[model samples]
Target chain A: NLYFQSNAMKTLKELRTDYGLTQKELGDLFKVSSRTIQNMEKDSTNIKDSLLSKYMSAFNVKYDDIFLGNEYENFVFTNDKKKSIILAFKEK
Target chain B: TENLYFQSNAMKTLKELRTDYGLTQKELGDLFKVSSRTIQNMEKDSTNIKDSLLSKYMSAFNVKYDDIFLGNEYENFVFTNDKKKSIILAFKEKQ
Candidate 1:
């Protein structure tokens, strides 16, 4: 019954702040504009895989660091292994 | 804990990968064994995402949360900017 929130944005914001990189610096690495990086933080756009991969390889971070499970966020949901199936039934 | 990052990353990745491949919500439904409406809701963050699905979604797109969510912001001096607006759905306010 629980709706969703922009967990992606939160993670992105956290990682960026964690490393202390500015939007302009990020844009240069990814070959994008500072506006694009800023827009990502603002939650105005959707997250992309190509970009995600770049970030991963660039930062040498793990997937769990950004999107492991609801437990990281303190919410009760299915285990990461079966979250999809649980969410499907819960929606109805 | 109200870690919005988890759910937000899940939904955002779903949208990004599906869109990148030009896969429609309905099309993705068949691939994921869910309904088109379900796909729609998932992208909109209207429905909760199970951990299993999250894993599958990750495999399908070959990406993780920080990979897709974190940007140059996390780097020291290098910066990578996202072109589109990352979607932020409403969730309980974290304390």
Candidate 2:
């Protein structure tokens, strides 16, 4: 499942790099060691939901931005919203 | 620390909430259109429940997402910019 790969670690690394924050700085934000942050960046398995929430809230990003799979990554957000509107109009 | 908290916490909350609501795993599975075994695995946390099904599970129990999943993380956390130092202080204070 995409859940195994998407979100959590990979996205965390991406976000940290994009923000230009070092592992130690990011770890400082979470009150964890740099090594802990490194492990999180490497591990693809499970992530704490609280940490995920903090990242989302801190960065002002959506869950989909981090957790979406390749199909969604390739999918245009505008088109998706447009399709939702079309479906809504059809229902109406 | 290990990330086992996800499975363990989810399973514990699932069992607690299901039993509190007097619902069986089979019945909960029916709500989400899955097999009883699927629900069993979920209860055991042997599998990660699909994101879509997670919403259904929350709805069936009339519970919030954090109610089932957040567990102790929410309890222990206090969001503060100075939180990092506080955590370290608490750690040393415990020693």
Candidate 3:
């Protein structure tokens, strides 16, 4: 069997336990909805890079350490991706 | 991919870097002799990321160039097309 390795899903429990903060308190601190906080903690959605960063900062942790592990590696390449570059901002 | 949320990755990176070094945006800006707003704008990608400033950021974050810019080749689309024949024909007509 060709088994592949994938990152394990982590909950906000670690963060709550580590930083000693309540779900509502954390939500208010970040100016986000309590439901949003709940979703993040439960991994109900793909943890966005932006929110992920905020979590790491508020909790004083590393992106790789919390998100990845040990040494974080590059993203996996796949043809099943729809990649495109769009124009943004006015040209000088 | 269907689900989407409002978030700013650039802001996240900036915040993480700031927290990592235990410095505030104002403090980091002071070191660079720039306004806190300037630093904030840079983090938000409102201001252009200058090569010189990027160099400083690299030093500050201790991150590699490729790691910061190119996370993966798949994410960055690279297409190879030959333009020689078209260029030569166009030049011949001009001459």
**Per-candidate DockQ versus the true complex?**
0.06, 0.02, 0.02
Isolated chain A: TM-score per model?
A: 0.53, 0.58, 0.54
The residue-by-residue lDDT of candidate 1 on A1-92, one tens digit each, is 12143232224544554335678867866778998777665552356777666565554455544442233332322122133333443444
Greater DockQ among 1 and 3 belongs to 1
Q: Please give, as one word, the docking class of candidate 1.
A: incorrect
By summed lDDT, the worst window of 10 consecutive residues in model 1 chain B runs over B86-95
Candidate 3, clashing residue pairs? Answer: none
> What's the residue-level lDDT of B20 in candidate 2?
37
TM-score of chain B of each: 0.54, 0.54, 0.51
Model 1 misplaced stretches (Cα beyond 4 Å): A1-92, B1-12, B68-95
B34 Cα displacement, candidate 1 (Å): 0.6
Cα lDDT tens digits for candidate 3, B68-92? 4421222221200112233234334
* Highest-scoring model, TM-score: 3
Q: Cα deviation of B75 in candidate 1 (Å)?
A: 22
Q: What are the per-residue Cα lDDT tens digits for candidate 2 across A1-92? A: 22233332225565565335578877777677899777666652366776776666655466755632233442332233223323332342
In the order shown, the candidates' Cα RMSDs to the true structure are 16.1, 15.7, 20.0
Which 10-residue window of candidate 2 chain B scores lowest in summed lDDT?
Answer: B1-10
Q: Where is model 2 more than 4 Å wrong at Cα?
A: A1-10, A67-92, B1-95
